[PDB]
């Protein structure tokens, strides 16, 4: 339940993604849990909130991340690998174009367990969450952010 | 299944990270299964 950056495990075991506990609520990408449950200690999480289009799901109550890309300014993923320890990899965005407007996008390229990493702005605020993008051969991650 | 969660860290910004990567601009569409594809 204390706020921070959490790695999510299965059952030997692996890590088959992570994910941010902010306010009481734990943040993670859908493709990272398809919802199931999680174990926390001896706690149980319960999905909440998902979204299969955004690729997001929320535990314990609704999605909390608010903040958002300026546009301009460097970020840095709070990357958590497998077996590898939380680490700051700081990078200029570039913009995934739609329809619908404009999203940052990260070219970084860590091991598929490492999606749901949070992306932060200079305050330490959670921008977006890693591991929902495209192929260009580099990987390319959205910034992807929910509704509060 | 057993799917549980570790602590790994504080949310925080680090001054002293490794700097790296590009800053593609794309245009991208996105589907009902929540998949980017690129559009020309």
Same mark, same amino acid.
């Given at each position: 339940?204390?706020?921070?950056?959490?790695?999510?495990?299965?059952?030997?075991?692996?890590?088959?993604?992570?994910?941010?506990?902010?306010?009481?609520?734990?943040? !993670?990408?859908?493709?990272?849990? +398809?919802?199931?449950?999680?174990?926390? $200690?001896?706690?149980? @999480? =319960?999905?909440?909130? *998902?979204?299969?289009?955004?690729?997001?799901?929320?535990?314990?109550?609704?999605?909390?991340?608010?903040?958002?890309?300026?546009?301009?300014?460097?970020?840095?993923?709070?990357?958590?690998?497998?077996?590898?320890?939380?680490?700051?990899?700081? !990078?200029?965005?570039?913009?995934? +174009?739609?329809?619908?407007?404009?999203? $940052?996008?990260?070219? @970084? =390229?860590?091991?598929? *367990?490492?999606?749901?990493?949070?992306?932060?702005?200079?305050?330490?605020?959670?921008?977006?969450?890693?591991?929902?993008?495209?192929?260009?051969?580099?990987?390319?991650?959205?910034?992807?952010?929910?509704?509060? | 299944?057993?799917?549980?969660?570790?602590?790994?860290?504080?949310?925080?910004?680090?001054?002293?990270?490794?700097?790296?990567?590009?800053?593609?601009?794309?245009?991208?569409?996105?589907?009902?299964?929540?998949?980017?594809?690129?559009?020309?």
């Amino acid at each position: 339940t204390t706020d921070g950056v959490y790695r999510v495990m299965t059952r030997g075991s692996t890590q088959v993604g992570v994910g941010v506990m902010q306010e009481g609520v734990f943040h !993670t990408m859908w493709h990272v849990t +398809k919802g199931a449950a999680l174990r926390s $200690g001896e706690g149980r @999480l =319960d999905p909440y909130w *998902g979204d299969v289009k955004q690729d997001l799901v929320s535990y314990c109550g609704p999605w909390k991340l608010d903040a958002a890309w300026d546009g301009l300014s460097e970020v840095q993923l709070l990357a958590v690998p497998p077996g590898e320890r939380a680490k700051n990899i700081q !990078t200029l965005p570039g913009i995934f +174009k739609t329809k619908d407007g404009d999203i $940052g996008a990260v070219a @970084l =390229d860590y091991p598929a *367990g490492t999606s749901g990493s949070p992306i932060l702005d200079k305050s330490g605020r959670v921008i977006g969450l890693y591991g929902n993008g495209v192929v260009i051969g580099s990987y390319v991650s959205a910034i992807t952010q929910g509704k509060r | 299944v057993d799917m549980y969660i570790e602590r790994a860290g504080d949310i925080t910004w680090e001054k002293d990270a490794e700097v790296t990567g590009n800053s593609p601009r794309l245009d991208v569409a996105l589907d009902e299964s929540g998949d980017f594809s690129l559009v020309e």
